[model samples]
Target: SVLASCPKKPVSSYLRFSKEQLPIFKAQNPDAKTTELIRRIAQRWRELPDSKKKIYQDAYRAEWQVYKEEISRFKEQLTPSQIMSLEKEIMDKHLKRKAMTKKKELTLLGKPKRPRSAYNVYVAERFQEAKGDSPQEKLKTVKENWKNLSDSEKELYIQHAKEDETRYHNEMKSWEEQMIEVGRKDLLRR
Candidate 1:
């Protein structure tokens, strides 16, 4: 029912549950926006009265198509800093929020989707602790993690762990806002 309102071309990041898990998500996140979206996905799992999974799925599919196109266009126009800001925000939220099991792990009560495990958050915190050191030290730590990591794990760290530990979004958003303020004076002068 709510999938009709979700962002299309879902983020391919591990933080997201697959499209197939929509029904399971419903029980875990009855009140969550993401959960509602899954409820709207086409009927494959449940059979409840007054449910139009097809309509919701179609709406979401159409919405996502436009969303994807718009996203592509927006990314093309965005400045490098703007793009990075968006990316960091998404990365921080994904790795720390949903993937880490901020909620429940499975559909236990047919209630709503919950985070399955807190490992993502745990790993993130550990990375943060390691990153407290100087850049050289951090790099060394990274190298060690790299050595210990399996191939798939290395991919996850490269894409998720590094940014999760660094508050790139917070730092960048603050910096960008300050720059916007600084630029306001220049515009006023003109």
Candidate 2:
């Protein structure tokens, strides 16, 4: 019998919360290397009060217990060699999925460019407003302006970005449907 693969267990809440800090850290220390940024973030995590840290620790233990049980049930059903073979297949699938994601990041000869973020859109508008500014000057201005924007002010651009995200998804769905109708469904996967 062919064994179905299970999705990887969810990450601990601590890691999830740590990831959310990356953008702010990157913005503050623009010159820091990736390793340094990670180290700094880890250091900050260590400094958090135990009461706050306890929340993530408890959540992680619950998830880990469930994961261990799931793994044991699977292990009981396979011989040692069969388990080794299944592990190899799982790793191969992981590599293949990563390769496919990398391929997606590269533009195909005829593909449209990926959509810009809300920040990018705001920067572009600011650049347009200062038409005579050099690129470097425009960049500095955009960064400063962005840093100064109140949360309420930023929400306006964030709302526009959300609308554009929905627009892109709707367009992609319509395009995929058109491809299926034309006997070119394979094109949609790429």
Candidate 3:
């Protein structure tokens, strides 16, 4: 199975945010200072406790109410599909803006590297050495090399992969934290 060939891990949590409030913002704040507001609000939110965060929560509710009202007005004025399409356009632009902020943050911190492949330099060297001339023969040699690995060699390879994954995960977490700082700024602007 293709899944068997892919990297495997214990599944992780996922979160989904609503887009319903987006239309309200666009309709009301068409030319607002979104980027600056987002940056400021993100910083402020981080400093707030759960109890103190209710103010923003109330604001979010108000915004969502306004969003629904604007959407209804749009629906009354435009065709059903046109209103829906406009909402999607507004949502896409907001998502793009958020993504751009994240990209900038990651660029400043540095990009994540690819996970290492299971095969190594020694495997390639062995492949080259066994078939110095023939193409099909080299392919056969590569397959034969894997088939020839002792149980001990396979165990060593698996151990290396585990260590590599652990190192990569740590690096990834560091990169992700940096991205989040920027992502919050992105959400605030909206």
Candidate 4:
């Protein structure tokens, strides 16, 4: 089943309390700032009689039962492979967000420049000169040009890429040490 196609899950018991109680709070302290209002609700929840929270608990659990039935029916509607694919993607969705966020944050925090491939090195300098009115056409023609280059010719770019990679590693080493000293170890490689 498509995770996106699933029915909305019900809010938890405490959440229902906040939703229903906040309105009453506003009436009691009409002039109170929103922050203080939430703070009151937070502490109020703790002090609230277990009997009060129990009502919302049963309400949430009742709705929760309906939610599970809807979600189960939604799963059964999917083809078996569709179900498997959904499971695979859902499991990896967690991996996807963590990877992408860290990747972007790394660049945002001034991680050292990554080196390009030998083929990329060729195109970086020559995509403009390659024959084409468009980017893809230029890329295709430039790629063909790289394939035609002699061993030593392509070696020159690879050699250049390796040199840049060395610089990246060297700079990253010092930058990592600097980040750790500044108490930002989360950015470092494991």
Best by TM-score: 4
Tell me the alpha-carbon RMSD of every candidate: 23.0, 20.9, 17.6, 5.7
Q: Summarize candidate 4's per-residue lDDT along 76-131 as a digit string, tens digits.
A: 89889878888788779999999999889878878887777877788889876888
How far residue 76's Cα lies from its native spot in candidate 3, in Å, is 40
User: Which of 1 and 4 is the better model by lDDT?
Assistant: 4
lDDT of 4 at 125: 91
Clashes of 2: 0
Q: How many backbone clashes does candidate 4 have?
A: 0
lDDT of 4 at 94: 90
Residue 37 accuracy (lDDT) in model 4: 84
Rank the candidate models, highest lDDT first: 4, 2, 3, 1
Candidate number with the higher TM-score (1 or 4): 4
lDDT by residue for model 3 over 1-190, one digit each (tens)?
2212322232211100113333444566678676654554455456658765565566666766776676566457566676567667768989999999988965666767545645653364556567746787777777777878877777766666677788778877776666677664332212
Please identify which of the two predictions, 1 or 2, would achieve the higher lDDT against the true structure. 2
Tell how far residue 60 is off in model 2, in angstroms: 72
For each candidate, what TM-score against the reference? 0.28, 0.37, 0.32, 0.60
lDDT of 2 by residue, 16-99 (tens): 657878888999999988789988988889898999888888888898899989988878878899888888988999999999
Candidate 2 has an lDDT of 0.77
53-148: candidate 1 lDDT, tens digit per residue:
455556666766888787787677667887777777778878887855633432231222222222454354456557646767855675576557
> How many clashes does each candidate structure show, in the order listed?
14, 0, 2, 0
Q: What is the full ranking by TM-score, best candidate first?
A: 4, 2, 3, 1
